[PDB]
Amino acid sequence: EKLLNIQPPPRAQWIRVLFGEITRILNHIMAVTTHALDIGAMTPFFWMFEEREKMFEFYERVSGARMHAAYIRPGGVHQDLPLGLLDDIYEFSKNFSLRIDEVEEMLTNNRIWRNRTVDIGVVTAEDALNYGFSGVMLRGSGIQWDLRKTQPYDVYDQVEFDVPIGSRGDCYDRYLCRVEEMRQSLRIIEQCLNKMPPGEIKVDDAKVSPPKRAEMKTSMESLIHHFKLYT
Amino acid sequence: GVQVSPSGEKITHTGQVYDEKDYRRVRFVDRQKEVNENFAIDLIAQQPVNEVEHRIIACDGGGGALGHPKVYINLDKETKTGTCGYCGLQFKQHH
Amino acid sequence: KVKQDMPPPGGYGPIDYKRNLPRRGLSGYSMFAVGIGALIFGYW
Amino acid sequence: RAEYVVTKLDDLINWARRSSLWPMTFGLACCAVEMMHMAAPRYDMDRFGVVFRASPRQADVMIVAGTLTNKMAPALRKVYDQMPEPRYVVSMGSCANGGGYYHYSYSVVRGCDRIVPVDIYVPGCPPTAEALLYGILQLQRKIKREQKLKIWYRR
Amino acid sequence: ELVEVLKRGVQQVTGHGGLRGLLRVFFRANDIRIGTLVGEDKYGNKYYEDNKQFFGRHRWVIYTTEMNGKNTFWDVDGSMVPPEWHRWLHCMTDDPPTTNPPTARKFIWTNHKFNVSATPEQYVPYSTTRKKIHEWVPPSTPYK
Amino acid sequence: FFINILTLLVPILIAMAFLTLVERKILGYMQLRKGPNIVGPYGILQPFADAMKLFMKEPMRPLTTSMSLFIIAPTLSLTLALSLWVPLPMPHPLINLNLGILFILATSSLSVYSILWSGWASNSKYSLFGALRAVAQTISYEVTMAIILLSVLLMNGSYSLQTLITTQEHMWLLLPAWPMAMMWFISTLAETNRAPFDLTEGESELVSGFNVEYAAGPFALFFMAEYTNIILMNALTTIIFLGPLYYINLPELYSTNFMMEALLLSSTFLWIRASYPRFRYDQLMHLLWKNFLPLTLALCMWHISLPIFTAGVPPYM
Amino acid sequence: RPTVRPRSDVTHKQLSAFGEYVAEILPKYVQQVQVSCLDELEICIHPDGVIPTLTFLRDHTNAQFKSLADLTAVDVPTRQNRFEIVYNLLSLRFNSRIRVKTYADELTPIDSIVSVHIAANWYEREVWDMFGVFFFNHPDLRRILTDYGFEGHPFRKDFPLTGYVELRYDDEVKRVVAEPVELAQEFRKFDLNSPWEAFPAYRQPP
Amino acid sequence: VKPIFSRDLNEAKRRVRELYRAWYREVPNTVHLMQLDITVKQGRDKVREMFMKNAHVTDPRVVDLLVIKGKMELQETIKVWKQRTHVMRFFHETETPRPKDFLSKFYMGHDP
Amino acid sequence: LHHAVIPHGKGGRSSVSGVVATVFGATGFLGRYVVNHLGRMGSQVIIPYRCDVYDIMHLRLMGDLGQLTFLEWDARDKDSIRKAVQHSNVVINLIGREWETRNFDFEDVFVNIPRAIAQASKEAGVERFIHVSHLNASMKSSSKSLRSKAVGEKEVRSVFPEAIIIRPSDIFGREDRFLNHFANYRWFLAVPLVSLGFKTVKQPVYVADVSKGIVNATKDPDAVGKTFAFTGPNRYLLFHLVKYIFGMTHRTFIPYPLPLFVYSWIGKLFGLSPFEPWTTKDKVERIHISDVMPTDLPGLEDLGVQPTPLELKSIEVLRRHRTYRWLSSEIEETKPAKTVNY
Amino acid sequence: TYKYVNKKEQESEVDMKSATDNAARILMWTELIRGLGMTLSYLFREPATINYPFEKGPLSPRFRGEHALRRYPSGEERCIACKLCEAICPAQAITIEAEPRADGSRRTTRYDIDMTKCIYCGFCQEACPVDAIVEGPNFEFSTETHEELLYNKEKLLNNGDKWEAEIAANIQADYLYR
Amino acid sequence: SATRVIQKLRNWASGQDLQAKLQLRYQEIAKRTQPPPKLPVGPSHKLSNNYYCTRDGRREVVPPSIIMSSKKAVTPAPPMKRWELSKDQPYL
Ligand SMILES: NC(=O)C1=CN([C@@H]2O[C@H](COP(=O)(O)OP(=O)(O)OC[C@H]3O[C@@H](n4cnc5c(N)ncnc54)[C@H](OP(=O)(O)O)[C@@H]3O)[C@@H](O)[C@H]2O)C=CC1
Ligand code: SF4
Ligand code: SF4
Ligand code: SF4
Ligand SMILES: [Zn+2]
């Protein structure tokens, strides 16, 4: 859409930011709990993969697949939300922060995880920028950089949230940065469900997004742009 | 109508059959070759012709956005059943 | 009339995202006074 | 009657292998997440008694998940050859079935059928965790309905 | 309330059709739970719904004893359910075919063939095309 | 006597098989799974089928291994794990040793010898890593564990095992000796390789440790020995520290109380397995020689001084 | 206009001034400066230019392009030097991105940036395995992403998409063996280039 | 043209002979340590045949890049990174070679 | 030819060779090597299997998509032979059992089963019939298996005149009953040999060379009706053969001189196991046999592949019996067996 | 807006009550007792598993599964040989070589759907202008041999004939969304 | 759900309330069947004053502006400021 110089609609931008932070919760939860499986805490993987199955059901409600969705098309998203998905997103978002509190109740403040993960893999910030580290690898070491805050793509300048940065560069600080990024992802979830705008889902340029299915059967130019946008 | 070969093979409705000396029939022993009973050629002869008063009819296959696009069929030649090329429901002028 | 997927009027409710951890157990002096006092009756 | 005793001993020796079969803590793909989702407690392995051991000497069934590249091919055949002799292979997903994407790539072996025998092809890019939990039900009934001591008897 | 949940356990023990029905549900489903019967299909599945359980646990089945001339006591799989009840069981709709039936068309199958791999009933693939290169046959008579 | 051998050795095998069943069910209910529901009435026929799968699968005869130690380590491992039960007290033991605590200590190290011979003669680099972290794990646990058993048998003056229940008739030894009890439970987790202190079986840093090349058969018989050691040291902690009320008119009431207490202790063991993350071979040795060995040397000091301060000199029998 | 993405000219004029500054500071050693639409600045330099231009962009006070994003060849076979080796930089202070291009073929290499950017220590191995572009002064330059014996750098346009080597297990040698490739179904290549002029401003002269 | 590390053909042949020296030291440790199947004389003959496959070229640029490729195969066979099957892929014992005479190439297919 | 049996291809996996072979007895060792070399060139092979699907499961990789049709079969029922033969154009017959069962004797599995397979082949009109026998088949052999195989050759010539009777010697391969039978003698810590190997002499012949020769016999147009004596490489005496096997294994080599009557008694009371036995009396009298040098009979070199020797490929197949002490010993660290000319 | 996650290291004059609180956090491991209480709270729950051969999964009406050819409501196979469904199928898994039917209409001779290929993405069911190809919500179609997941035309047609009672209800409940 | 004794044990052992917030969906998920919604028009679904020659984004992009091919200090932007501490949580 940048190469075609095409803006999506604001409903497409906010559903992109909303499901990108569902995606951020998905990758941070798999990251922390699969790292807990690599350490030896097998149980946050199970207790958080139940919630990951619930968010895969959200993915399957919005697009149709569990993982390989192919939903965020160039020029806005493919289809709409199903009716009453956002109520289930709100009902999951009420109860997920207690699960975050339970997983960091077991794992953050305890001796075993703290002794295994403090002062391990201490990266210098200048050596991290020389090695080309990015995102949570930088935010463990404490250099303040987040692409939703300093170079705002989509509609991420509209939402307001906090950037978790560490102060010692270790495994424990990177895990705490990921857990705090889940909590700030929950804050972006609350802001998206507060200010999701009405509108349409793809771009209304028929040469960029494919046209609607009701207008494809009735209008000829939609059949041309459907045909030569799909072959 | 599902026809039968002299080898007992069901003729597929496109006209595909395997020859009697063919080695590609050996995937069908102790198994079965799938042929549907509802032939798509024979499932249009049961459809009646539609007697309509329009000189140009519009067809969509029923449902609007459910079926095929809304295309327009001429009915001027009364000796020929004016068909819809997506579907095949035969139309005819009332007079 | 459209029937789009929107939040309801009045908005959605508040979402908890801050870290809320309970202060369970008790004070560390009296918890030691339980455990040292468990030794004294046990040794008696 | 001896054939009834032979078939009931065949059912008694196949009941153990259909129930307590022990898979592999594999990886390699997108499809590594859905093996972890069959481990996850919605559609569950361990309700059937399907346990992710890590060792190939202790494994009983191999869930090949996703892409099997040209570098991964001796790293798959070496592991399957060091599985002990009841060896069943599930192929999760379309890249282990016949190369779902990357069929025409330079560095994907075009399915897991080129290297090992695969006893059940479970399709999808997600096989959902219930869909190859159906796949472990169908391998479970497949090596229920296999006859080992019966064709040991009539031989 | 502990005697109320013990009465719940006694009720779900005594509600599944006597001791033989209790033992066949206990050794087929391996879950003894009772709900209302939302519909019996043409093959013999007994469909149950209990909305006090979870979203996902609330709709369940008890399968057939016979299906297409096969003993299905301990051999139960995924694709035994009819397609008209598939939408109800996998929570794609809130309407069973007892309440809201689907549209019936004249070409549709009146019996569900189940998933049929490693059976004499089996899909095997083939070309669905004719012979594109027609050969030249020799003549039946010689040159002289 | 052989009737007592068979009716003590068969139902301990049924008990450890059901311990593996309640491991899978208790870790399942901890992890929001249901556990192995589909086979048996509620799971009961799963570990019988696990033995009947793993013993009707074949083992390897690898080229790289040494075959004599390959076949002589797991026969040892099942013999020592089933032979630590024979000095265990119950009401009245199958065999009453004169000094059985040293038998428990030495033959519990000989189980690690079976693990260590598996690690060397399995002849992988992974198996050699597992053998040397068995060495480092016993470097961590053994001196600490014998100082704990010494410093509690300064309250019960002999090494006999019936003397523990005639000492613990009136009260448990949890209440005078809870700094002994917490570090003994941690040290017997380090003994029997459970998921906080499980290295050497590994499964999350290396592949299998002592049973990398050990296929079904000998891996199953190691698995038999390992969970026999789990229920064994659960019952040993149960008899030595939270030893129940002992009535000479009613030994079966005390045996039922001991078995409710031992299933509580085994649920605590699997609860600790599904509650804590896993140690390291450096930090394991580090805190079991840093945060344990001065504390258990001071507890050895205090229980040396305890027949002098409060003048309880223990009797011989 | 909600369809078109809005254009701010302030980033285009400050990138024009900064590209003028980099072409001013390196006149021997910068060939082309392109401040494109979508507001990205591309600086195309010599094959000898890469070490001091990237040392300038890493260590200069106004530049501060410390983090390297990616090292990437593209293979255009209609040039004399086929591989455009690009280096994407990133300012951690000034919030911008230089796309440095340089040209190469397979026979004139580039000095590698491992001596200044240790981010690219795996990116050099990636592009040497991927395109056949050798780099100087590397610690251990190695083919990593193709096989141990995959003869042929695959991302060149002269390489086919299917490849040359397929693998198959053979019971004859009891190992996985390589074969010359043949396919069950061919790659059905399409001709999706429409014959009409798509963009009238992007037209080549005849 | 700006050259790679070998300036001329004599220095390029010197580095070629140094790489052949390292392969000739490399082969018996590979056959002894990989649990290999081939004769060590067969391995040295295959190294000589793979050199004579590429030894019809003049340019020191492509000779030095073949030295770079052979050093990569050298370090992947010294440090045990090329396996038994990856070493044995060079022999191609699953496939008879295509017939050089015209008549069997006429018979076996449409090959020019 | 037909419109799909024509060989448009390049001789690989997805290529078509048109060699539609029903490989009877493909489940074992010679069958797994010839189904490998048949699907290497690329064909739809037809595999009738008598055992479970699990012991034939490792054959599923041996060709392209849908190129291996596994049909179960019983040896008594003629319809099971008929439905596997009747769509083919070449039938390979590798029916072999070196021991006896209760349902199948030494003679019926080599006479009456190739009688029924060639009778269904002559009823179905396939072109070539690659029946494999032993080259020591006569009427006066001491073992019963060669006496069964000679009259099986007589009856298969009676019911099939254009039948290619390929006659290998003792085939050696990775899972064989020759090399592993000679190298599993280390558990008894002695090799009881028949007259110390001084009156018997053998030619071990490689299984890929036999399978490549069977594939070239199916593809050879002028080889129909022949009788291929299929002995290849250099001729070894048995004392030097077991000396080569045990010197390459580097185990203890004490050859026990035991006579033929007592060692056949050892085989007779050793073959009573209800599983697959370690040795049998006809296996013992096939060890005590001399494979003669064949006169005017064609073999490997006129069919199109050269026989690989035992010294070139013995490290492929004898590596499964060594210890770790001498695991990495290559070809040159052992002494080759002495080659005799008689 | 940034936020620190681990920055509390300061000598803040730790007194007797907070020092005994830290020295009772260590040497009793009461936060490990807290983690034990967390797992004790989770063991007393009715678990989240379903018993899948008798209690099947939660899904969606848009859940794309097994490929199927639909049919019109009055007979007549819906596929009209457009060939835009293999120009959109990114695995190149569809061969649909066709002819005139010698009845005046337009159908296909061959369909091929490769289930050992293909991406399960719904590109074809969004490119089909008549909705002939559809992705009916099966997931219980795992086969044992590699032949049986090469769906040509007849398996696809009786698949859609098998599943037309559910697919048409999904399209009738879903066609306002797309 | 379980009864009150197990509910109070779960609430004490977690440390907070657990019947208010469940990870198990009982009735918090709405009805899976739905009324059919109406997809709205876009800002280019106009009958009048709607041209692709004014609405295009694919043809307003030109070839790239070549500056130099063959004054004070210049920065690629204003130099960015560090962010502020969060008012909800400064530390953790
Ligand atoms: N040691 C050797 O390998 C030698 C073999 N030969 C000859 O080579 C040929 C094949 O040898 P090889 O592969 O090693 O032999 P195997 O022991 O491996 O068995 C060959 C095949 O015969 C089948 N078979 C055996 N008995 C019966 C029966 N009663 N009914 C149906 N099928 C049966 C087996 O199937 P199933 O799995 O069901 O048993 C198997 O597939 C034979 O003609 C043999 O005489 C000659 C010299 C040496
Ligand atoms: S089968 Fe699909 S989901 Fe699995 S690895 Fe391949 S592309 Fe990813
Ligand atoms: S787009 Fe639809 S109707 Fe057209 S060829 Fe494909 S499946 Fe058939
Ligand atoms: S779902 Fe996607 S992958 Fe499958 S047929 Fe349709 S276009 Fe191909
Ligand atoms: Zn119509």
PDB file of N, CA and C and ligand atoms in Angstrom, chain D residues 155, chain I residues 25-31 50-51 73 75 94-98 104 109-110 113 132 134 149 169-171 177-178 286, ligand 1:
ATOM      1  N   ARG D 155       0.935 -68.532   8.209  1.00  0.00           N
ATOM      2  CA  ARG D 155       2.156 -68.110   7.539  1.00  0.00           C
ATOM      3  C   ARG D 155       2.778 -69.268   6.774  1.00  0.00           C
TER       4      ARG D 155
ATOM      5  N   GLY I  25       6.203 -61.544  -3.981  1.00  0.00           N
ATOM      6  CA  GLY I  25       7.193 -61.627  -2.927  1.00  0.00           C
ATOM      7  C   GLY I  25       8.073 -60.402  -2.830  1.00  0.00           C
ATOM      8  N   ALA I  26       7.486 -59.212  -2.928  1.00  0.00           N
ATOM      9  CA  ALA I  26       8.274 -57.990  -2.867  1.00  0.00           C
ATOM     10  C   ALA I  26       8.530 -57.508  -1.449  1.00  0.00           C
ATOM     11  N   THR I  27       7.975 -58.178  -0.441  1.00  0.00           N
ATOM     12  CA  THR I  27       8.014 -57.683   0.928  1.00  0.00           C
ATOM     13  C   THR I  27       9.362 -57.886   1.605  1.00  0.00           C
ATOM     14  N   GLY I  28      10.212 -58.756   1.075  1.00  0.00           N
ATOM     15  CA  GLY I  28      11.395 -59.157   1.806  1.00  0.00           C
ATOM     16  C   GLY I  28      12.631 -58.334   1.523  1.00  0.00           C
ATOM     17  N   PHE I  29      13.641 -58.979   0.945  1.00  0.00           N
ATOM     18  CA  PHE I  29      14.972 -58.407   0.775  1.00  0.00           C
ATOM     19  C   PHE I  29      15.302 -58.181  -0.694  1.00  0.00           C
ATOM     20  N   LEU I  30      15.218 -59.235  -1.515  1.00  0.00           N
ATOM     21  CA  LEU I  30      15.378 -59.102  -2.960  1.00  0.00           C
ATOM     22  C   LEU I  30      14.239 -58.304  -3.573  1.00  0.00           C
ATOM     23  N   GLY I  31      13.045 -58.434  -2.997  1.00  0.00           N
ATOM     24  CA  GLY I  31      11.916 -57.640  -3.435  1.00  0.00           C
ATOM     25  C   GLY I  31      12.030 -56.169  -3.095  1.00  0.00           C
ATOM     26  N   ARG I  50       1.498 -60.714   1.523  1.00  0.00           N
ATOM     27  CA  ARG I  50       0.841 -61.714   2.352  1.00  0.00           C
ATOM     28  C   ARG I  50       0.818 -61.332   3.821  1.00  0.00           C
ATOM     29  N   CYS I  51       1.858 -60.647   4.297  1.00  0.00           N
ATOM     30  CA  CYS I  51       1.985 -60.232   5.690  1.00  0.00           C
ATOM     31  C   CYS I  51       1.213 -58.948   5.976  1.00  0.00           C
ATOM     32  N   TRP I  73      -2.760 -60.579  -0.654  1.00  0.00           N
ATOM     33  CA  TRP I  73      -2.991 -61.819  -1.379  1.00  0.00           C
ATOM     34  C   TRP I  73      -2.732 -63.014  -0.476  1.00  0.00           C
ATOM     35  N   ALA I  75      -1.842 -67.251  -0.895  1.00  0.00           N
ATOM     36  CA  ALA I  75      -1.154 -68.075  -1.884  1.00  0.00           C
ATOM     37  C   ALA I  75      -2.059 -69.145  -2.481  1.00  0.00           C
ATOM     38  N   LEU I  94       9.670 -63.596  -7.030  1.00  0.00           N
ATOM     39  CA  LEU I  94      10.738 -63.729  -6.050  1.00  0.00           C
ATOM     40  C   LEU I  94      10.226 -64.427  -4.799  1.00  0.00           C
ATOM     41  N   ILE I  95       9.405 -65.457  -4.983  1.00  0.00           N
ATOM     42  CA  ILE I  95       8.802 -66.172  -3.864  1.00  0.00           C
ATOM     43  C   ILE I  95       9.862 -67.066  -3.237  1.00  0.00           C
ATOM     44  N   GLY I  96      10.216 -66.776  -1.989  1.00  0.00           N
ATOM     45  CA  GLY I  96      11.295 -67.495  -1.348  1.00  0.00           C
ATOM     46  C   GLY I  96      11.172 -67.621   0.152  1.00  0.00           C
ATOM     47  N   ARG I  97      11.384 -68.830   0.660  1.00  0.00           N
ATOM     48  CA  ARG I  97      11.444 -69.067   2.095  1.00  0.00           C
ATOM     49  C   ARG I  97      12.541 -70.085   2.347  1.00  0.00           C
ATOM     50  N   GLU I  98      13.579 -69.673   3.072  1.00  0.00           N
ATOM     51  CA  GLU I  98      14.722 -70.543   3.309  1.00  0.00           C
ATOM     52  C   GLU I  98      14.450 -71.599   4.373  1.00  0.00           C
ATOM     53  N   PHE I 104       3.290 -74.111   4.893  1.00  0.00           N
ATOM     54  CA  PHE I 104       4.096 -74.144   3.679  1.00  0.00           C
ATOM     55  C   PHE I 104       5.352 -74.958   3.943  1.00  0.00           C
ATOM     56  N   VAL I 109       6.216 -73.964  -1.768  1.00  0.00           N
ATOM     57  CA  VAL I 109       6.484 -72.543  -1.982  1.00  0.00           C
ATOM     58  C   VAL I 109       7.417 -72.291  -3.160  1.00  0.00           C
ATOM     59  N   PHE I 110       8.084 -73.324  -3.678  1.00  0.00           N
ATOM     60  CA  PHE I 110       8.911 -73.194  -4.865  1.00  0.00           C
ATOM     61  C   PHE I 110       8.357 -73.932  -6.074  1.00  0.00           C
ATOM     62  N   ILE I 113       3.341 -72.568  -5.932  1.00  0.00           N
ATOM     63  CA  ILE I 113       3.081 -71.130  -5.955  1.00  0.00           C
ATOM     64  C   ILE I 113       3.621 -70.485  -7.242  1.00  0.00           C
ATOM     65  N   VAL I 132      12.826 -66.183 -10.297  1.00  0.00           N
ATOM     66  CA  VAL I 132      14.164 -66.282  -9.718  1.00  0.00           C
ATOM     67  C   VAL I 132      14.276 -67.603  -8.963  1.00  0.00           C
ATOM     68  N   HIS I 134      17.576 -70.811  -7.788  1.00  0.00           N
ATOM     69  CA  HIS I 134      18.964 -70.942  -7.377  1.00  0.00           C
ATOM     70  C   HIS I 134      19.746 -71.645  -8.476  1.00  0.00           C
ATOM     71  N   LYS I 149      13.510 -76.488  -6.161  1.00  0.00           N
ATOM     72  CA  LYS I 149      13.634 -75.382  -7.103  1.00  0.00           C
ATOM     73  C   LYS I 149      13.896 -75.855  -8.528  1.00  0.00           C
ATOM     74  N   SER I 169      23.324 -66.756  -7.206  1.00  0.00           N
ATOM     75  CA  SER I 169      24.061 -67.474  -6.177  1.00  0.00           C
ATOM     76  C   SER I 169      23.622 -66.931  -4.817  1.00  0.00           C
ATOM     77  N   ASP I 170      24.432 -67.131  -3.777  1.00  0.00           N
ATOM     78  CA  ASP I 170      24.151 -66.598  -2.441  1.00  0.00           C
ATOM     79  C   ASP I 170      24.216 -65.074  -2.476  1.00  0.00           C
ATOM     80  N   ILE I 171      23.042 -64.442  -2.471  1.00  0.00           N
ATOM     81  CA  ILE I 171      22.927 -62.994  -2.610  1.00  0.00           C
ATOM     82  C   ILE I 171      23.323 -62.338  -1.299  1.00  0.00           C
ATOM     83  N   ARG I 177      20.354 -63.362   4.656  1.00  0.00           N
ATOM     84  CA  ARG I 177      20.574 -64.587   5.410  1.00  0.00           C
ATOM     85  C   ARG I 177      21.856 -65.293   4.989  1.00  0.00           C
ATOM     86  N   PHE I 178      22.823 -64.540   4.470  1.00  0.00           N
ATOM     87  CA  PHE I 178      24.144 -65.069   4.160  1.00  0.00           C
ATOM     88  C   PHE I 178      25.222 -64.418   5.016  1.00  0.00           C
ATOM     89  N   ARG I 286      22.918 -75.913   2.212  1.00  0.00           N
ATOM     90  CA  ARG I 286      23.217 -74.883   1.227  1.00  0.00           C
ATOM     91  C   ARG I 286      24.503 -74.133   1.539  1.00  0.00           C
TER      92      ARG I 286
HETATM   93  N1  LIG L   1      19.498 -65.353   1.240  1.00  0.00           N
HETATM   94  C1  LIG L   1      18.892 -64.840   0.178  1.00  0.00           C
HETATM   95  O1  LIG L   1      18.322 -63.740   0.203  1.00  0.00           O
HETATM   96  C2  LIG L   1      18.914 -65.623  -1.073  1.00  0.00           C
HETATM   97  C3  LIG L   1      17.790 -65.685  -1.816  1.00  0.00           C
HETATM   98  N2  LIG L   1      17.711 -66.384  -2.997  1.00  0.00           N
HETATM   99  C4  LIG L   1      16.468 -66.420  -3.761  1.00  0.00           C
HETATM  100  O2  LIG L   1      16.036 -65.092  -3.974  1.00  0.00           O
HETATM  101  C5  LIG L   1      14.593 -65.033  -3.949  1.00  0.00           C
HETATM  102  C6  LIG L   1      14.142 -63.980  -2.968  1.00  0.00           C
HETATM  103  O3  LIG L   1      14.977 -64.023  -1.793  1.00  0.00           O
HETATM  104  P1  LIG L   1      14.728 -63.182  -0.463  1.00  0.00           P
HETATM  105  O4  LIG L   1      14.177 -61.829  -0.686  1.00  0.00           O
HETATM  106  O5  LIG L   1      16.051 -63.078   0.275  1.00  0.00           O
HETATM  107  O6  LIG L   1      13.739 -64.025   0.457  1.00  0.00           O
HETATM  108  P2  LIG L   1      12.802 -63.617   1.677  1.00  0.00           P
HETATM  109  O7  LIG L   1      13.106 -64.461   2.851  1.00  0.00           O
HETATM  110  O8  LIG L   1      13.076 -62.153   2.000  1.00  0.00           O
HETATM  111  O9  LIG L   1      11.289 -63.736   1.156  1.00  0.00           O
HETATM  112  C7  LIG L   1      11.005 -63.444  -0.228  1.00  0.00           C
HETATM  113  C8  LIG L   1       9.544 -63.104  -0.366  1.00  0.00           C
HETATM  114  O10 LIG L   1       8.761 -64.318  -0.417  1.00  0.00           O
HETATM  115  C9  LIG L   1       7.550 -64.104   0.275  1.00  0.00           C
HETATM  116  N3  LIG L   1       7.014 -65.393   0.696  1.00  0.00           N
HETATM  117  C10 LIG L   1       7.669 -66.379   1.387  1.00  0.00           C
HETATM  118  N4  LIG L   1       6.929 -67.426   1.658  1.00  0.00           N
HETATM  119  C11 LIG L   1       5.695 -67.109   1.103  1.00  0.00           C
HETATM  120  C12 LIG L   1       4.471 -67.798   1.053  1.00  0.00           C
HETATM  121  N5  LIG L   1       4.271 -69.001   1.596  1.00  0.00           N
HETATM  122  N6  LIG L   1       3.435 -67.196   0.422  1.00  0.00           N
HETATM  123  C13 LIG L   1       3.621 -65.987  -0.118  1.00  0.00           C
HETATM  124  N7  LIG L   1       4.729 -65.242  -0.128  1.00  0.00           N
HETATM  125  C14 LIG L   1       5.740 -65.862   0.505  1.00  0.00           C
HETATM  126  C15 LIG L   1       7.929 -63.195   1.437  1.00  0.00           C
HETATM  127  O11 LIG L   1       6.787 -62.472   1.942  1.00  0.00           O
HETATM  128  P3  LIG L   1       6.364 -62.447   3.502  1.00  0.00           P
HETATM  129  O12 LIG L   1       6.957 -61.156   4.061  1.00  0.00           O
HETATM  130  O13 LIG L   1       4.884 -62.521   3.639  1.00  0.00           O
HETATM  131  O14 LIG L   1       7.091 -63.618   4.155  1.00  0.00           O
HETATM  132  C16 LIG L   1       8.964 -62.281   0.787  1.00  0.00           C
HETATM  133  O15 LIG L   1       8.347 -61.098   0.291  1.00  0.00           O
HETATM  134  C17 LIG L   1      14.103 -66.456  -3.679  1.00  0.00           C
HETATM  135  O16 LIG L   1      13.717 -67.093  -4.891  1.00  0.00           O
HETATM  136  C18 LIG L   1      15.323 -67.131  -3.045  1.00  0.00           C
HETATM  137  O17 LIG L   1      15.355 -68.527  -3.312  1.00  0.00           O
HETATM  138  C19 LIG L   1      18.816 -67.047  -3.449  1.00  0.00           C
HETATM  139  C20 LIG L   1      19.965 -67.052  -2.798  1.00  0.00           C
HETATM  140  C21 LIG L   1      20.156 -66.333  -1.513  1.00  0.00           C
END
